[PDB]
Amino acid sequence: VAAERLEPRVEEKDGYWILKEQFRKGINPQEKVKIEKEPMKLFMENGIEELAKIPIEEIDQSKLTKDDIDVRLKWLGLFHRRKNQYGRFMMRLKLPNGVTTSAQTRYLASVIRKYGKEGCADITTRQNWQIRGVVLPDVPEILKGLAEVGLTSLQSGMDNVRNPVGNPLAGIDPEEIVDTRPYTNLLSQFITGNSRGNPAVSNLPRKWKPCVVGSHDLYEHPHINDLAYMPATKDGRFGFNLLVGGFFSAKRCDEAIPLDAWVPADDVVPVCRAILEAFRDLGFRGNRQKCRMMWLIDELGVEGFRAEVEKRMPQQQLERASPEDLVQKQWERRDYLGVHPQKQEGYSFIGLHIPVGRVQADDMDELARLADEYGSGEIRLTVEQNIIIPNIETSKIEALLKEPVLSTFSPDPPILMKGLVACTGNQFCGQAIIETKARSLKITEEVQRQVSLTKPVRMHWTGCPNTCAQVQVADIGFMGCLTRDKNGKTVEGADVFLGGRIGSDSHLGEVYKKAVPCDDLVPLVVDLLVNNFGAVPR
Ligand code: SRM
Ligand code: SF4
Ligand SMILES: O=N[O-]
Ligand SMILES: [Cl-]
Ligand SMILES: [Cl-]
Numbered sequence: 001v002a003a004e005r006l007e008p009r010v011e012e013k014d015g016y017w018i019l020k021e022q023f024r025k026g027i028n029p030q031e032k033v034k035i036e037k038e039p040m041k042l043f044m045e046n047g048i049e050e051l052a053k054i055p056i057e058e059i060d061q062s063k064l065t066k067d068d069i070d071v072r073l074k075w076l077g078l079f080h081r082r083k084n085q086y087g088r089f090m091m092r093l094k095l096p097n098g099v100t101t102s103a104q105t106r107y108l109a110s111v112i113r114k115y116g117k118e119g120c121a122d123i124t125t126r127q128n129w130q131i132r133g134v135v136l137p138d139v140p141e142i143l144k145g146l147a148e149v150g151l152t153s154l155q156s157g158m159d160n161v162r163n164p165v166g167n168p169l170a171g172i173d174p175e176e177i178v179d180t181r182p183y184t185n186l187l188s189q190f191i192t193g194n195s196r197g198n199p200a201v202s203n204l205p206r207k208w209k210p211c212v213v214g215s216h217d218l219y220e221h222p223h224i225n226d227l228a229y230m231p232a233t234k235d236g237r238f239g240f241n242l243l244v245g246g247f248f249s250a251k252r253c254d255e256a257i258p259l260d261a262w263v264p265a266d267d268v269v270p271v272c273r274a275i276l277e278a279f280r281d282l283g284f285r286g287n288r289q290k291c292r293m294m295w296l297i298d299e300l301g302v303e304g305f306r307a308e309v310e311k312r313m314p315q316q317q318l319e320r321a322s323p324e325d326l327v328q329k330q331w332e333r334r335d336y337l338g339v340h341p342q343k344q345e346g347y348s349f350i351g352l353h354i355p356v357g358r359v360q361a362d363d364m365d366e367l368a369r370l371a372d373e374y375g376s377g378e379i380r381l382t383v384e385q386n387i388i389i390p391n392i393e394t395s396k397i398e399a400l401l402k403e404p405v406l407s408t409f410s411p412d413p414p415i416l417m418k419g420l421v422a423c424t425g426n427q428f429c430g431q432a433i434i435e436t437k438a439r440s441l442k443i444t445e446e447v448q449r450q451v452s453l454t455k456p457v458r459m460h461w462t463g464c465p466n467t468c469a470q471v472q473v474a475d476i477g478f479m480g481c482l483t484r485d486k487n488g489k490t491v492e493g494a495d496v497f498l499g500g501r502i503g504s505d506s507h508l509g510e511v512y513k514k515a516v517p518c519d520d521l522v523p524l525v526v527d528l529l530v531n532n533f534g535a536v537p538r
């Protein structure tokens with residue numbers, strides 16, 4: 001690799017970071033959008049105010065403004081549902097470590113309630129909230145309301161740092177390694193510039209996902225993150241070994257690899273900055289399918305990339321990885337659903353199953369009420385699109401278990417539901433090939449009616465090859481496709497994946513059977529469970 005290759009490709013200009021003229025040749029259309037107008041201006045210069053006043057039919061008549069609503073607004077966490085819900089926007093937060101409050105939950109509920117049949121909310125596979133039904137004229141008021149309850153939606157889509165994932169049991173688990181909340185909080189504050197916006201990290205070549213590990217269970221899925229902080233002592237000091245480049249895409253899935261670097265705990269933000277700066281400065285900006293950070297690591301080599309991180313550290317020093325970390329390989333991932341004692345004596349947390357992560361406004365109000373009446377007003381989201389309500393006096397549990405809402409959001413659902421994960425799918429997502437959420441519930445219900453089991457089999461349903469529901473981590477994964485019935489008629493189908501493992505001995509699953517009609521999945525899955533996971537016919 002030439003020294004020429006290491007020339008930073010972006011420069012700061014008027015508070016924003018833009019591609020240098022000499023590196024603009026051959027860029028993808030999204031890069032052209034970012035050059036034509038800096039997306040962060042919609043927030044940081046209040047461009048949203050004037051944009052929100054223009055009727056959508058008029059917005060659609062010019063490239064600049066159509067790109068505003070279809071692309072640039074994703075820097076404000078707003079996602080136009082052009083194909084499947086025209087004129088309406090999904091909105092996605094920053095929610096480091098999945099931690100929310102009853103006040104925030106009620107606020108989000110009040111927004112979606114306004115939109116009636118066009119509104120609902122979802123828990124995401126990055127332990128985050130999404131809301132639906134948002135109309136453009138309401139955006140300025142929603143941004144204000146979010147700020148008032150201590151939320152931001154900044155930089156949650158497109159070429160930005162995505163939600164920082166942590167340990168859902170942070171601070172409450174007797175068995176935790178390190179409380180991940182301070183670190184995920186610090187990362188979120190850094191990424192979003194304390195909710196004001198941080199242009200230094202908003203013009204990446206592509207999305208980029210961080211997590212901080214605090215559990216032996218590895219609830220955080222470090223193996224699939226662009227940066228994962230693995231807790232580790234080095235030379236008598238607490239810090240993190242760093243894994244880099246993990247990602248999924250339609251083209252390629254790759255597990256994170258060691259950077260061969262360790263940082264003391266206080267260097268979490270400096271190293272996140274250094275890595276993001278290296279990626280921003282040096283990343284390829286052509287074919288979008290070759291823009292994720294792992295591709296830069298492949299081009300430079302891990303040592304080449306490491307040197308670029310090192311040069312961007314304060315005092316330009318980066319220690320080598322510590323030989324061992326604090327994560328025990330001897331571990332069985334713990335089921336967090338149900339009632340469990342906290343490390344604080346006299347207190348319990350409860351894990352509640354949220355069927356395919358979908359909630360309506362009334363459901364959100366009920367969950368917020370439970371958190372206030374029984375806990376401390378806190379609600380935690382998980383990457384299996386479930387919830388935990390922590391900080392419940394254990395003496396209140398008998399009463400809690402009698403709450404009617406717990407029949408819908410159960411602390412002890414059937415075992416197959418506990419592990420069921422499904423992406424948005426074609427109810428709202430324009431990329432989706434099939435319907436996912438309703439289908440996956442119906443199929444899982446019919447399968448569990450036929451078999452009993454004891455192994456916690458994890459089933460993931462994703463609507464297209466983008467694999468937002470991570471089918472490659474599943475015991476049994478289902479990827480949307482169109483296929484053919486016995487009469488050659490078009491029907492919805494799934495490619496079925498097997499082999500995904502999580503925790504310390506992680507592994508990426510692969511396609512086992514292509515193009516199975518959805519209507520034929522029940523018998524296939526019943527047999528797989530009996531034949532491979534010890535399930536017993538009922
Ligand atoms: C909501 C969520 C799935 C869910 O039901 O939980 C989701 C939904 C979408 N993802 Fe994703 N992704 C979600 C996690 C994922 C993950 C899983 C993860 O982060 O662990 C991945 C695979 C892991 C990865 O990227 O490394 C995933 C891979 C993608 C990709 C393909 C990435 C690539 O490099 O090719 C796209 C398309 C793209 O960016 O080009 C995408 C794009 C999309 C969009 C924004 C596409 C669009 O505008 O319609 C989806 C919005 C649909 C909607 O209305 O909800 N989504 N997306 C997740 C939101 C996470 C969050 O809170 O930030
Ligand atoms: S996997 Fe495909 S269908 Fe599902 S939310 Fe992601 S982009 Fe949409
Ligand atoms: O929107 N998930 O990259
Ligand atoms: Cl996006
Ligand atoms: Cl769309």
Ligand SMILES: [K+]
Binds near residue numbers: 353421
């Ligand atoms: K769930």
